[PDB]
Amino acid sequence: MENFTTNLNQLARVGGIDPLIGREKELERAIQVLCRRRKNNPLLVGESGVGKTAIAEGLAWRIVQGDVPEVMADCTIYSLDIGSLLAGTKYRGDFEKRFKALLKQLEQDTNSILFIDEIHTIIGAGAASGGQVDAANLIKPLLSSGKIRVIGSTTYQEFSNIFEKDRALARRFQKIDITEPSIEETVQIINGLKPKYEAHHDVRYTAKAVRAAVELAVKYINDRHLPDKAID
Amino acid sequence: MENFTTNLNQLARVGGIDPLIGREKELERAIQVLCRRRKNNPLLVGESGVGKTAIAEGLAWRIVQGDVPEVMADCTIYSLDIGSLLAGTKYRGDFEKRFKALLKQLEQDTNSILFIDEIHTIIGAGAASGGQVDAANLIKPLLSSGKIRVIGSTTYQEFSNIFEKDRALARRFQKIDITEPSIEETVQIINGLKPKYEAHHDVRYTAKAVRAAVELAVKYINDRHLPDKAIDVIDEAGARARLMPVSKRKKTVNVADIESVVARIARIPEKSVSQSDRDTLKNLGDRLKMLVFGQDKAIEALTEAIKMARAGLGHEHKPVGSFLFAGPTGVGKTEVTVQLSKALGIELLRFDMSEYMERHTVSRLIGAPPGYVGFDQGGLLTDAVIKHPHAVLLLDEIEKAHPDVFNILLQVMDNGTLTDNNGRKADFRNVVLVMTTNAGVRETERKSIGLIHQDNSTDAMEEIKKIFTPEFRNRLDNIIWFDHLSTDVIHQVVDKFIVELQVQLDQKGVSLEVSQEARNWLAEKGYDRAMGARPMARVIQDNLKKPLANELLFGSLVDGGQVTVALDKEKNELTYGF
Amino acid sequence: VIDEAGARARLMPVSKRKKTVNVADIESVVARIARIPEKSVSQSDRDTLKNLGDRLKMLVFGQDKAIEALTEAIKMARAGLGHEHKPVGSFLFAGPTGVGKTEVTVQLSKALGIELLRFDMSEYMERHTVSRLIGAPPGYVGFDQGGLLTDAVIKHPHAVLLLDEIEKAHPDVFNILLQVMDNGTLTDNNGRKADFRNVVLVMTTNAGVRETERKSIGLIHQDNSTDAMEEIKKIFTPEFRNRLDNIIWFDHLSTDVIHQVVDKFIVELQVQLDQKGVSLEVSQEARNWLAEKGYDRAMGARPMARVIQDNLKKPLANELLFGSLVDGGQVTVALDKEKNELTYGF
Ligand SMILES: Nc1ncnc2c1ncn2[C@@H]1O[C@@H](COP(=O)(O)OP(=O)(O)OP(O)(O)=S)[C@H](O)[C@H]1O
Numbered sequence A: 001m002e003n004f005t006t007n008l009n010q011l012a013r014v015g016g017i018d019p020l021i022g023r024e025k026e027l028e029r030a031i032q033v034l035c036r037r038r039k040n041n042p043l044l045v046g047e048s049g050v051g052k053t054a055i056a057e058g059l060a061w062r063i064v065q066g067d068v069p070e071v072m073a074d075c076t077i078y079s080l081d082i083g084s085l086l087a088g089t090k091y092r093g094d095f096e097k098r099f100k101a102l103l104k105q106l107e108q109d110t111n112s113i114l115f116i117d118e119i120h121t122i123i124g125a126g127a128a129s130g131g132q133v134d135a136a137n138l139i140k141p142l143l144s145s146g147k148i149r150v151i152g153s154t155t156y157q158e159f160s161n162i163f164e165k166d167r168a169l170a171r172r173f174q175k176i177d178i179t180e181p182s183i184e185e186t187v188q189i190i191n192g193l194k195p196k197y198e199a200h201h202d203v204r205y206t207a208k209a210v211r212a213a214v215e216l217a218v219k220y221i222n223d224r225h226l227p228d229k230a231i232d
Numbered sequence B: 001m002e003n004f005t006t007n008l009n010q011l012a013r014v015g016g017i018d019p020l021i022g023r024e025k026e027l028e029r030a031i032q033v034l035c036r037r038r039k040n041n042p043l044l045v046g047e048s049g050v051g052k053t054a055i056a057e058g059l060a061w062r063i064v065q066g067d068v069p070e071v072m073a074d075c076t077i078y079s080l081d082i083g084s085l086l087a088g089t090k091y092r093g094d095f096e097k098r099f100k101a102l103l104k105q106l107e108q109d110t111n112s113i114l115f116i117d118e119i120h121t122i123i124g125a126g127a128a129s130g131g132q133v134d135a136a137n138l139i140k141p142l143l144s145s146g147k148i149r150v151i152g153s154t155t156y157q158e159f160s161n162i163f164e165k166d167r168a169l170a171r172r173f174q175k176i177d178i179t180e181p182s183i184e185e186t187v188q189i190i191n192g193l194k195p196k197y198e199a200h201h202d203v204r205y206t207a208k209a210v211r212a213a214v215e216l217a218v219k220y221i222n223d224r225h226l227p228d229k230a231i232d233v234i235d236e237a238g239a240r241a242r243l244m245p246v247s248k249r250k251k252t253v254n255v256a257d258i259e260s261v262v263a264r265i266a267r268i269p270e271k272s273v274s275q276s277d278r279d280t281l282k283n284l285g286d287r288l289k290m291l292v293f294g295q296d297k298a299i300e301a302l303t304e305a306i307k308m309a310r311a312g313l314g315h316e317h318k319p320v321g322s323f324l325f326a327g328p329t330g331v332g333k334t335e336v337t338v339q340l341s342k343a344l345g346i347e348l349l350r351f352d353m354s355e356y357m358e359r360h361t362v363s364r365l366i367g368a369p370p371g372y373v374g375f376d377q378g379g380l381l382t383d384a385v386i387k388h389p390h391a392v393l394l395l396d397e398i399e400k401a402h403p404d405v406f407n408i409l410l411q412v413m414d415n416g417t418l419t420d421n422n423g424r425k426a427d428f429r430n431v432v433l434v435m436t437t438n439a440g441v442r443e444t445e446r447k448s449i450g451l452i453h454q455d456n457s458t459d460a461m462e463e464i465k466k467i468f469t470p471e472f473r474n475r476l477d478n479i480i481w482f483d484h485l486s487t488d489v490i491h492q493v494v495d496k497f498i499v500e501l502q503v504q505l506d507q508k509g510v511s512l513e514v515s516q517e518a519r520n521w522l523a524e525k526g527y528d529r530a531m532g533a534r535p536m537a538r539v540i541q542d543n544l545k546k547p548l549a550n551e552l553l554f555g556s557l558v559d560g561g562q563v564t565v566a567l568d569k570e571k572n573e574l575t576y577g578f
Numbered sequence C: 001v002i003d004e005a006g007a008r009a010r011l012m013p014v015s016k017r018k019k020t021v022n023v024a025d026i027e028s029v030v031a032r033i034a035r036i037p038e039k040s041v042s043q044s045d046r047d048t049l050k051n052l053g054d055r056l057k058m059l060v061f062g063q064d065k066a067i068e069a070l071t072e073a074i075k076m077a078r079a080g081l082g083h084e085h086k087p088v089g090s091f092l093f094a095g096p097t098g099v100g101k102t103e104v105t106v107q108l109s110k111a112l113g114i115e116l117l118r119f120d121m122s123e124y125m126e127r128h129t130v131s132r133l134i135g136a137p138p139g140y141v142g143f144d145q146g147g148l149l150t151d152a153v154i155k156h157p158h159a160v161l162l163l164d165e166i167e168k169a170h171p172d173v174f175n176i177l178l179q180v181m182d183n184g185t186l187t188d189n190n191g192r193k194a195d196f197r198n199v200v201l202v203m204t205t206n207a208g209v210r211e212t213e214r215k216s217i218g219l220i221h222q223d224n225s226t227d228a229m230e231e232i233k234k235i236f237t238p239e240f241r242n243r244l245d246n247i248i249w250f251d252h253l254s255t256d257v258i259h260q261v262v263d264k265f266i267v268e269l270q271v272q273l274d275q276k277g278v279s280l281e282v283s284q285e286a287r288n289w290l291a292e293k294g295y296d297r298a299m300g301a302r303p304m305a306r307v308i309q310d311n312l313k314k315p316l317a318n319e320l321l322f323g324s325l326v327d328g329g330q331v332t333v334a335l336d337k338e339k340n341e342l343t344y345g346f
């Protein structure tokens, strides 16, 4: 994992990620899933611009900031790349060897969670000739056995067409809906995120300006979800 | 085999394998297959989550416990990991150097059995710019010769799309069908497994909690199969309860906790009424009566259906209710539905039936058949109902859709389901279905010919009956015929519209007041029985909004104050201010 | 078959008993391999079949003839006197609305302990939807999805297959059934064959409903059940009709039946209330009143449910939601004579 994943606690420690505001029920539902005896693997599913990663990274942030329970504290969440994981896997046997090594390192850690962001892609990495022997087929038994813990994430147009079809794989994840926040909730996250926009652009925002941005975006912009339409 | 397989007897000895409960027949057949002269290789095939894996490991467990016919005694079952088997095979001959070594050890032992989970994946090992000579080709000669024994495992889909394509390999396995267990069987499986969960979570489950988990999961979770769906309810309730002692809420897992967990998993409420949501329901009718004037029976029908569903005295498997609203234009048919979804805090799914004008447009709602261009789109209706399972579904002007599009609703209203083009089922048991129409109106608005006037009041129903087939009508909860608005209502409507104007003005920072006579005048001026409230909006726009727009745009009202509208008597003209 | 029978016999003297292999052992083995019903003349199934007709008569009231047609087909086939290559039986049910046509089939699969496969024919309007049932040809996008019908009949070879409102599918869809009803098979897009020899096929229809509920012009009214037969004949081609085992015309419900139907619905209500901790008792007079208030010969039984919903369920919903009947209700319903109104409360 040394050259495949990112330690998200390390990013939280250096300010590499934005803070999470609210979403308490989204952070309480995921924690319970991770505590299960078997198949303790939450999957976050939602519409684009709902705030699914704000939840996934927000958890690594809270661990670093100490705002977790007595079961999450002192735990590491690693973010996995697929590109570097497969890059260079020429010669049959290299992909399986590399992947199994990653899985073993996680299995022997026992105190870490792997995060896969584009969870609608680990359904192939095998030989071009087939059959199977890909990242899904090589992971299923550890998810099943409760040996590793992963967090997934996907859209409603990616989990209904490419994730709701592999029945054995889908059975091993617990689906959590992430829904769109309302206006008051959006205003609050803007206030929470605001200091970084203010710093970046050397400006400060009028409190009224923040409310106006949220309400006007709701009234006039039709193809996006809040509060992603307000942040822009 | 040293780093390729796991000795399952060893795992059973150290507690790595959960025990089997039941499945005597499924296991007995496997034993008979393994005792055949040739091709003595059972294959376990079924839906996922039914114990296919549990049975294969379960046998290793029974051998360890000595609970076998003594033909199986002293057999060792090894589990093969394909992932380690191929990991180092970089050079030509390495894959054949490992595969053959393992086979010789198994053949020489003769008591061992190899278990290959997810067997459809052993149809590739070589791929080195060649072909064939893979794991399947190298196994075939031992299986048909009776030298080795293996146990397979696969789901029906994988077995119908992949495994069976190689007929020579397929004829070397003996398929056994493992079916999902019954209610009683599931309860017993959980009762025998619960000590593992109680130990893991430091919880204790009550007897009723176990039964509730099984019966509720069957009723609300339609995605999975037993026992696995019931086991998840139990395990999550356990995991949840273990995070309560943190606030010192040490407890057992009761039925109430099971009910809360199922409600969360299925995204449907149940024991969330004990909350002062009761208050929301209690005065739901009043909030709606303050928005829609008159048409009170329509309001009651909707609130009565909702309360029954919440009380618990609902329909076993039907939408919350299904109503047809019919009547003259501009009287609030659409308005009552829209305000309901807001009052309840739930999504309104709107479909406009004049879009489903032609017969073939029905595929727009449910999706194209396989082999067609829009196949990957899905249906618009079945998708909407999956995204939001608790909702108000409004189909406007259902008297403009294809005379055949009604046949889709027919099955929804009675059974609660609709199947899309991929076989997924939308579940409508938690939605409110409202359809609106002008179907009976044209017929009552007639002038009769003769000396004695006739009563045309029954014609509205005579026309609806001729439009909606009996098999459709007979499954509606009701038909609510809406009335024309009275003049008393108009006064209430005028006040409503004036308030909306006052709000639009408050936003600009100016304030409007209208004397009572000015209001009475507007109300009388715009009344037209034939078109309900829509003309009142037009009269206000013409009399109050136009003057204001010019004062607001060409100074005067621009950043102004008090505008007072009053009626003179001489001309019946209105006054204005600042 | 020979080798498995051998292995089976080899595993007999583990119970001491030694065996040779007779025809009976061969028959047991083949039935297991093929996933079909063995000697049910000595199995508890013999009693299950013996009184199958009564379990169904206690759930669907009246329409005895439909129940009899279904149970004889099952016993006959199970007895060994079956068809060489046809479904267990192929029936078309027709009649006025609001009956148990769709209720006479669902209960059958429950009574027998077997899987009900349901398809809604109203979802097969367009003619190209046939591929939805049997699969896309090679070269097309859904090729790898399989078949909903062809696929369902394989996972469950012993089942009840119900095709609802078969009078709403595009007519070309019926030409698939012509193969199944006569030969017992259907080939999917991978060349695999469905095998319907252990499937009971029931189709239900509303052809002719509009006509049977029509009043004629004249002094004397007619029995229009004949018109429905005339309508069925125009929808289903002769080559289809001549392959059915039966067409069963369901009757209207009489008032004697309604009393039984009302009692049935009240029990369902009592069960829901017991779940809430509240028992319910209803006076016979109140019941007779509900039955008379709701009966309508023309709309079948569905209206009776509506009557119960307004007279008993609504009052209770308020007693349960804005009421102190939580975990304890014991309400009583009786009819007065003065207004014919019902009583309520603990
Ligand atoms: N409660 C919150 N607190 C802080 N940031 C939030 C919160 N909710 C959403 N955000 C998002 O913070 C930034 C990151 O959004 P994301 O979580 O990545 O959306 P997303 O759903 O993950 O995007 P996808 O998965 O690519 S569709 C965006 O500007 C906000 O939408």
Ligand SMILES: Nc1ncnc2c1ncn2[C@@H]1O[C@@H](COP(=O)(O)OP(=O)(O)OP(O)(O)=S)[C@H](O)[C@H]1O
Pocket: A144, A167, A168, A171, B018, B019, B020, B021, B022, B023, B047, B048, B049, B050, B051, B052, B053, B054, B055, B155, B189, B193, B227, B228, B231
């Ligand atoms: N008779 C039984 N006794 C005890 N546990 C059982 C029994 N049958 C099924 N299970 C459960 O089945 C386990 C889940 O995995 P399995 O269903 O055995 O594997 P599977 O059938 O091959 O499904 P996959 O791995 O998703 S394809 C649960 O942990 C077991 O409790």
Ligand SMILES: Nc1ncnc2c1ncn2[C@@H]1O[C@@H](COP(=O)(O)OP(=O)(O)OP(O)(O)=S)[C@H](O)[C@H]1O
Pocket: B291, B292, B293, B294, B295, B328, B329, B330, B331, B332, B333, B334, B335, B336, B436, B438, B485, B489, B493, B496, B532, B533, B534
């Ligand atoms: N009884 C009423 N009480 C208050 N406002 C009403 C009433 N009836 C009509 N309106 C007004 O008319 C609404 C326009 O939509 P609807 O009246 O609901 O249209 P409709 O009655 O459904 O008839 P259609 O669809 O035009 S034929 C305005 O939003 C309402 O303010």
Ligand SMILES: Nc1ncnc2c1ncn2[C@H]1O[C@@H](COP(=O)(O)OP(=O)(O)OP(O)(O)=S)[C@H](O)[C@H]1O
Pocket: B471, B474, C059, C060, C061, C062, C063, C096, C097, C098, C099, C100, C101, C102, C103, C104, C206, C253, C257, C261, C264, C301, C302, C305
């Ligand atoms: N004769 C009966 N005996 C007992 N229960 C019945 C009877 N008829 C109907 N039911 C019940 O079965 C429910 C489901 O509808 P069905 O009776 O099966 O009507 P149907 O056969 O489906 O024909 P349609 O679709 O209404 S035209 C009814 O709502 C109940 O009243």
